[PDB]
Scaffold this motif. Structure first.
Motif, PDB file in Angstrom:
ATOM      1  N   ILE A  71      41.730  64.271  50.145  1.00  0.00           N
ATOM      2  CA  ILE A  71      40.452  64.936  49.871  1.00  0.00           C
ATOM      3  C   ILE A  71      39.943  65.668  51.093  1.00  0.00           C
ATOM      4  N   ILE A  72      40.446  65.354  52.272  1.00  0.00           N
ATOM      5  CA  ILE A  72      40.204  66.289  53.327  1.00  0.00           C
ATOM      6  C   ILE A  72      41.140  67.476  53.392  1.00  0.00           C
ATOM      7  N   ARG A  73      42.451  67.257  53.398  1.00  0.00           N
ATOM      8  CA  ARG A  73      43.406  68.366  53.305  1.00  0.00           C
ATOM      9  C   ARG A  73      43.063  69.305  52.147  1.00  0.00           C
ATOM     10  N   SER A  74      42.481  68.739  51.100  1.00  0.00           N
ATOM     11  CA  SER A  74      41.983  69.497  49.970  1.00  0.00           C
ATOM     12  C   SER A  74      40.969  70.622  50.246  1.00  0.00           C
ATOM     13  N   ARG A  75      40.113  70.499  51.268  1.00  0.00           N
ATOM     14  CA  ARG A  75      39.082  71.525  51.538  1.00  0.00           C
ATOM     15  C   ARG A  75      39.453  72.533  52.624  1.00  0.00           C
ATOM     16  N   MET A  76      40.698  72.412  53.078  1.00  0.00           N
ATOM     17  CA  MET A  76      41.352  73.164  54.116  1.00  0.00           C
ATOM     18  C   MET A  76      42.193  74.157  53.309  1.00  0.00           C
ATOM     19  N   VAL A  77      42.998  75.020  53.911  1.00  0.00           N
ATOM     20  CA  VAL A  77      43.366  76.240  53.168  1.00  0.00           C
ATOM     21  C   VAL A  77      44.819  76.602  52.999  1.00  0.00           C
ATOM     22  N   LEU A  78      45.295  76.417  51.762  1.00  0.00           N
ATOM     23  CA  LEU A  78      46.708  76.515  51.275  1.00  0.00           C
ATOM     24  C   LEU A  78      47.762  75.575  51.945  1.00  0.00           C
ATOM     25  N   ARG A  79      47.327  74.339  52.249  1.00  0.00           N
ATOM     26  CA  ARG A  79      47.902  73.531  53.336  1.00  0.00           C
ATOM     27  C   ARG A  79      48.760  72.232  53.425  1.00  0.00           C
ATOM     28  N   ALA A  80      49.599  71.975  52.417  1.00  0.00           N
ATOM     29  CA  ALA A  80      50.218  70.648  52.203  1.00  0.00           C
ATOM     30  C   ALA A  80      51.741  70.535  52.418  1.00  0.00           C
ATOM     31  N   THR A  81      52.389  71.652  52.761  1.00  0.00           N
ATOM     32  CA  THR A  81      53.702  71.751  53.455  1.00  0.00           C
ATOM     33  C   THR A  81      53.617  71.335  54.958  1.00  0.00           C
ATOM     34  N   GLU A  82      52.387  71.094  55.402  1.00  0.00           N
ATOM     35  CA  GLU A  82      51.911  71.065  56.783  1.00  0.00           C
ATOM     36  C   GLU A  82      50.906  69.916  56.834  1.00  0.00           C
ATOM     37  N   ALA A  83      51.250  68.924  57.664  1.00  0.00           N
ATOM     38  CA  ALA A  83      50.524  67.646  57.767  1.00  0.00           C
ATOM     39  C   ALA A  83      49.724  67.597  59.032  1.00  0.00           C
ATOM     40  N   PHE A  84      48.743  66.728  59.042  1.00  0.00           N
ATOM     41  CA  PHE A  84      47.946  66.586  60.215  1.00  0.00           C
ATOM     42  C   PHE A  84      47.528  65.156  60.173  1.00  0.00           C
ATOM     43  N   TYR A  85      47.468  64.547  61.345  1.00  0.00           N
ATOM     44  CA  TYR A  85      47.125  63.160  61.462  1.00  0.00           C
ATOM     45  C   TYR A  85      45.632  63.053  61.287  1.00  0.00           C
ATOM     46  N   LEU A  86      45.165  61.883  60.863  1.00  0.00           N
ATOM     47  CA  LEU A  86      43.728  61.631  60.803  1.00  0.00           C
ATOM     48  C   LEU A  86      43.439  60.354  61.577  1.00  0.00           C
ATOM     49  N   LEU A  87      42.844  60.540  62.758  1.00  0.00           N
ATOM     50  CA  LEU A  87      42.592  59.456  63.730  1.00  0.00           C
ATOM     51  C   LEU A  87      41.170  58.972  63.753  1.00  0.00           C
ATOM     52  N   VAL A  88      41.031  57.655  63.762  1.00  0.00           N
ATOM     53  CA  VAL A  88      39.723  57.095  63.918  1.00  0.00           C
ATOM     54  C   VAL A  88      39.333  57.175  65.382  1.00  0.00           C
ATOM     55  N   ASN A  89      38.166  57.778  65.608  1.00  0.00           N
ATOM     56  CA  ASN A  89      37.580  57.892  66.927  1.00  0.00           C
ATOM     57  C   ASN A  89      38.434  58.773  67.803  1.00  0.00           C
ATOM     58  N   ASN A  90      39.303  59.571  67.185  1.00  0.00           N
ATOM     59  CA  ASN A  90      40.280  60.365  67.923  1.00  0.00           C
ATOM     60  C   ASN A  90      41.259  59.536  68.711  1.00  0.00           C
ATOM     61  N   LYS A  91      41.127  58.217  68.612  1.00  0.00           N
ATOM     62  CA  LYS A  91      41.888  57.315  69.452  1.00  0.00           C
ATOM     63  C   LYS A  91      42.986  56.538  68.726  1.00  0.00           C
ATOM     64  N   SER A  92      42.800  56.223  67.454  1.00  0.00           N
ATOM     65  CA  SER A  92      43.108  55.023  66.676  1.00  0.00           C
ATOM     66  C   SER A  92      43.898  55.707  65.557  1.00  0.00           C
ATOM     67  N   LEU A  93      45.193  55.427  65.511  1.00  0.00           N
ATOM     68  CA  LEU A  93      46.055  55.608  64.359  1.00  0.00           C
ATOM     69  C   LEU A  93      46.085  54.361  63.547  1.00  0.00           C
ATOM     70  N   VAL A  94      45.866  54.509  62.247  1.00  0.00           N
ATOM     71  CA  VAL A  94      45.577  53.340  61.410  1.00  0.00           C
ATOM     72  C   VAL A  94      46.483  53.162  60.195  1.00  0.00           C
ATOM     73  N   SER A  95      46.303  52.069  59.454  1.00  0.00           N
ATOM     74  CA  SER A  95      47.074  51.924  58.231  1.00  0.00           C
ATOM     75  C   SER A  95      46.604  53.088  57.415  1.00  0.00           C
ATOM     76  N   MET A  96      47.504  53.656  56.599  1.00  0.00           N
ATOM     77  CA  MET A  96      47.179  54.704  55.598  1.00  0.00           C
ATOM     78  C   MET A  96      47.022  54.104  54.202  1.00  0.00           C
TER      79      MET A  96
END
Length: 124
Positions: A71-96
């Motif tokens: 639902i975030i990648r969803s509001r971004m533009v033509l974009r799902a061949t192309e991944a981006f990490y989503l970090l908590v606090n910019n610090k913290s990679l978490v369970s998905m």
């Protein structure tokens, strides 16, 4: 080939003193109270990615980051061949695989806002 850099309108840590926002935390927790507020800032430094129409999302007690991510990648533009990490606090990679409740237990910031950054790549 110089990658470029984009507006990156200023961090919302910084757009409030704590007391400008502390209200809002309390305020929205009051009207839809059984929901978790997320702040989603682009990584400050991030260059290939486009930044969001809006920053303060409400969430369900229980939502996989994966869904959330979508639902975030969803509001971004033509974009799902192309991944981006989503970090908590910019610090913290978490369970998905983790209910939002779960994350709001761990990392609820000083104010009730759980902050996230999202980036196309980061070193630490």
């Amino acid at each position: 080939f110089v990658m470029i850099g984009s507006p990156s309108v200023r961090p919302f840590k910084q757009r409030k003193s704590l007391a400008i926002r502390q209200e809002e935390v309390a305020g929205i927790r009051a009207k839809f109270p059984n929901k978790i507020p997320v702040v989603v800032e682009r990584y400050p430094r991030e260059t290939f990615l486009p930044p969001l129409d809006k920053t303060k999302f409400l969430v369900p007690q229980e939502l996989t980051m994966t869904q959330f991510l979508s639902i975030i990648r969803s509001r971004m533009v033509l974009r799902a061949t192309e991944a981006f990490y989503l970090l908590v606090n910019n610090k913290s990679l978490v369970s998905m695989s983790a209910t939002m409740a779960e994350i709001y237990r761990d990392y609820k910031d000083e104010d009730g806002f759980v902050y996230m950054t999202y980036a196309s790549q980061e070193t630490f």
